[PDB]
């Protein structure tokens, strides 16, 4: 198992047709998982499954600029389950990050950070056993 939190360098940032794949298993009684696509200290795309926000499960997505979180985008469709293996695929498209979980489309997140080639790290954190994190150009 990879050590969490895990940093995956994205050399030269991201670009349309880059596909990032995260394989792992949610811990029992998980609280949160997070993917942070970072541009330096900024977070271009934060993808944050929350397993117990007021006894509901929700995915919170956002951007952090100059240390300030912006307007959250919330998705109530929640494909993760404590104790179970998952696959997250993040496909960079011209206008958005497109996320599928377990081969089913989940959400899109419009690019707020415009300098895609400066989004050069992916941080993976939270209540998972992390099996692998990789990228490929499709």
Ligand X SMILES: CC(=O)N[C@@H]1[C@@H](O)[C@H](O[C@@H]2O[C@H](CO)[C@H](O)[C@H](O)[C@H]2NC(C)=O)[C@@H](CO)O[C@@H]1O
Binding-site residues for a beta-D-galactoside sit at 69-75
CB of 37 to Cl ion, least distance (A): 13
Residue ranges at the known binding site? 69-75
The residue from 113, 116, 128, 133 that contacts Cl ion (CB under 5 A) is 113
1 burial (CB, 10 Å; 0-12 / 13-18 / 19+) is exposed
Contact 121, 15 (CB under 8 A): no
Nearest to 63 by CA among 121, 18, 111: 111
Per rule CB under 6 A, is residue 72 in the interface with ligand X?
A: yes
Per rule CB under 5 A, is residue 114 in the interface with Cl ion?
A: yes
The residue from 7, 21, 62, 89 that contacts ligand X (CB under 6 A) is 62
The residue from 44, 47, 48, 51 that contacts ligand X (CB under 6 A) is 48
Nearest to 27 by CA among 135, 127, 133, 136: 127
Which residues are at the interface with ligand X (CB under 6 A)?
Answer: 46, 48, 60, 62, 69, 72
């Amino acid at each position: 198992m990879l050590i969490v939190p895990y940093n995956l360098p994205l050399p030269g940032g991201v670009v349309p047709r880059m596909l990032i794949t995260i394989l792992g298993t949610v811990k029992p009684n998980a609280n949160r998982i997070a993917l942070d696509f970072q541009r330096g200290n900024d977070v271009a795309f934060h993808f944050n499954p929350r397993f117990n926000e007021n006894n509901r499960r929700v995915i919170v997505c956002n951007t952090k600029l100059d240390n300030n979180w912006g307007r959250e985008e919330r998705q109530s469709v929640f494909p993760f389950e404590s104790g179970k293996p998952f696959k997250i695929q993040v496909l960079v498209e011209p206008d958005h990050f497109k996320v599928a979980v377990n081969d089913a489309h989940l959400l899109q997140y419009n690019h707020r950070v415009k300098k895609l080639n400066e989004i050069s790290k992916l941080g993976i954190s939270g209540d998972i056993d992390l099996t692998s994190a990789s990228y490929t150009m499709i």
